[PDB]
Design an enzyme around this catalytic site. Structure first.
Site, PDB file in Angstrom:
ATOM      1  N   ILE A  34      19.749  38.833  13.627  1.00 12.38           N
ATOM      2  CA  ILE A  34      19.584  39.332  12.263  1.00 12.38           C
ATOM      3  C   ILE A  34      20.471  38.598  11.274  1.00 12.38           C
ATOM      4  CG2 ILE A  34      18.923  41.578  13.227  1.00 12.38           C
ATOM      5  CD1 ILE A  34      21.306  42.736  11.523  1.00 12.38           C
ATOM      6  N   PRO A  41      26.209  31.695  12.860  1.00 18.10           N
ATOM      7  CA  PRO A  41      25.727  31.265  14.175  1.00 18.10           C
ATOM      8  C   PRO A  41      25.881  32.379  15.195  1.00 18.10           C
ATOM      9  CG  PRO A  41      27.934  30.456  13.857  1.00 18.10           C
ATOM     10  CD  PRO A  41      27.569  31.203  12.584  1.00 18.10           C
ATOM     11  N   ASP A  42      25.029  32.336  16.218  1.00  9.93           N
ATOM     12  CA  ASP A  42      25.163  33.246  17.347  1.00  9.93           C
ATOM     13  C   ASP A  42      26.360  32.795  18.169  1.00  9.93           C
ATOM     14  OD1 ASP A  42      24.989  34.779  19.640  1.00  9.93           O
ATOM     15  OD2 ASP A  42      22.941  34.205  20.126  1.00  9.93           O
ATOM     16  N   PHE A  43      27.459  33.542  18.078  1.00 13.20           N
ATOM     17  CA  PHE A  43      28.701  33.117  18.721  1.00 13.20           C
ATOM     18  C   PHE A  43      28.609  33.127  20.241  1.00 13.20           C
ATOM     19  CE2 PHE A  43      30.144  34.929  14.585  1.00 13.20           C
ATOM     20  CZ  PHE A  43      30.568  33.748  14.022  1.00 13.20           C
ATOM     21  N   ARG A  44      27.719  33.931  20.817  1.00 10.46           N
ATOM     22  CA  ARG A  44      27.552  33.989  22.262  1.00 10.46           C
ATOM     23  C   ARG A  44      26.582  32.951  22.800  1.00 10.46           C
ATOM     24  NH1 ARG A  44      29.683  37.819  25.129  1.00 10.46           N
ATOM     25  NH2 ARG A  44      30.780  39.530  24.073  1.00 10.46           N
ATOM     26  N   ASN A 115      27.245  42.435  16.077  1.00 11.74           N
ATOM     27  CA  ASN A 115      27.729  41.381  15.194  1.00 11.74           C
ATOM     28  C   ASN A 115      29.081  41.740  14.602  1.00 11.74           C
ATOM     29  OD1 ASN A 115      25.210  40.299  15.678  1.00 11.74           O
ATOM     30  ND2 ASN A 115      24.387  40.802  13.651  1.00 11.74           N
ATOM     31  N   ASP A 117      30.151  40.030  11.713  1.00 14.43           N
ATOM     32  CA  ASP A 117      30.107  39.284  10.462  1.00 14.43           C
ATOM     33  C   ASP A 117      30.193  40.137   9.209  1.00 14.43           C
ATOM     34  OD1 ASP A 117      27.454  40.301  10.060  1.00 14.43           O
ATOM     35  OD2 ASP A 117      26.709  38.701  11.353  1.00 14.43           O
ATOM     36  N   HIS A 134      31.141  45.431  19.071  1.00 15.56           N
ATOM     37  CA  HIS A 134      32.014  44.316  19.404  1.00 15.56           C
ATOM     38  C   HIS A 134      33.123  44.148  18.376  1.00 15.56           C
ATOM     39  CE1 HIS A 134      28.715  42.445  22.178  1.00 15.56           C
ATOM     40  NE2 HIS A 134      29.188  43.596  22.622  1.00 15.56           N
ATOM     41  N   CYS A 171      56.210  44.918   9.210  1.00 12.85           N
ATOM     42  CA  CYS A 171      56.978  44.751  10.433  1.00 12.85           C
ATOM     43  C   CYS A 171      56.980  43.333  10.985  1.00 12.85           C
ATOM     44  CB  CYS A 171      56.471  45.710  11.521  1.00 12.85           C
ATOM     45  SG  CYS A 171      54.914  45.197  12.285  1.00 12.85           S
TER      46      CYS A 171
HETATM   47 ZN   LIG Z   1      53.051  46.037  11.179  1.00 10.54          ZN
END
Ligand SMILES: [Zn+2]
Length: 296
Positions: A34, A41-44, A115, A117, A134, A171
């Site tokens: 989609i 890009p399709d990272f997988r 996705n 993105d 994910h 921190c």
């Molecule tokens: Zn922190």
């Protein structure tokens, strides 16, 4: 199998079912297909070459670049790759806006996405509508458990492009985008929502996913047996593996699964047309794209 909910196993049959009183709650399951038309890009996909050109970082193993403990020891490779792959624009596709229309029309129970993105959020799906299975780049968090300061994508993008490793202002610990790394669990929300949502679903709209990555793929087996399942995807997917509750589009026993094969945007346009939503969808997409193009 005349007791089936779809009058015919076609996009027309799905549209008729959607506009009938029997279809009130739609779950979308979406993946990389989609977003490819948005330039993401399709990272997988191996063809993306995500694990090519990593020799420069001297990793102990290629996946270390996406492993949480390695990241906490050596975050620079990940952020260098993130700069290299950072999209030039975040313009959601017709498919994303089709899901916004589902939300507007009161039909969207949930969108489960693989996705990262953020395009679902840009298109107007809210946190409550989404299960980012994910994770996402939409937020980043300080990695220290006692702090967990949250940072928006604009802050993280500035750090990525200036090539300054992002550190928490409170921190000084590393700040990590909210994507699921190796060595991390999928978000609790994925399992929590799955357990409730699949008791309530009337239609599964599976768009732009080959259903090859677990446990996301197993979502299709969670639907009630009567629930129609429409796949809009470039290739047929989700059927049982001849080798190793899959999709049954084509056997004489098929009764509820429909495959529309083509670009996701074109399939959503075709479905919108059947529903009488094509003008609404065009007006929404054109206005939102204009707004994104006009950001000053
Ligand atoms: Zn922190």
């Amino acid at each position: 199998h005349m007791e089936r909910l779809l009058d015919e196993l076609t996009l027309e049959g799905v549209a008729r079912y959607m506009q009938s009183e029997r279809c009130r709650r739609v779950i979308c399951l979406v993946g990389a297909g989609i977003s490819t038309s948005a330039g993401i890009p399709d990272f997988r996909s191996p063809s993306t070459g995500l694990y090519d050109n990593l020799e420069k970082y001297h990793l102990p193993y290629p996946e270390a670049i996406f492993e949480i403990s390695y990241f906490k020891k050596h975050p620079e490779p990940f952020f260098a790759l993130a700069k290299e792959l950072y999209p030039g624009q975040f313009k959601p596709t017709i498919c994303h806006y089709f899901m916004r229309l589902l939300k507007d029309k009161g039909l969207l129970l949930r969108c489960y996405t693989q996705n990262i993105d953020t395009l679902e959020r840009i298109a107007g799906l809210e946190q409550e509508d989404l299960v980012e299975a994910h994770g996402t780049f939409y937020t980043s968090h300080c990695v220290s458990a006692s702090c967990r300061h949250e940072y928006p994508l604009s802050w993280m993008k500035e750090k990525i492009f200036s090539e300054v490793t992002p550190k928490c202002e409170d921190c000084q610990s590393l700040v990590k985008p909210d994507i699921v790394f190796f060595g991390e669990s999928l978000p609790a929300r994925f399992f929590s929502c799955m357990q409730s949502d699949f008791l309530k679903v009337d239609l599964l709209l599976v768009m732009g996913t080959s259903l090859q990555v677990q446990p996301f793929a197993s979502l299709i087996s969670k639907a009630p047996l009567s629930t129609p399942r429409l796949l809009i995807n470039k290739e047929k997917a989700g059927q049982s593996d001849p080798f190793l509750g899959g999709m049954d589009f084509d056997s004489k026993k098929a009764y509820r699964d429909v495959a529309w094969l083509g670009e996701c945007d074109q399939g959503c346009l075709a479905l919108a047309e059947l529903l009488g939503w094509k003008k609404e969808l065009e007006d929404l997409v054109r206005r939102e794209h204009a707004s994104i193009d006009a950001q000053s």
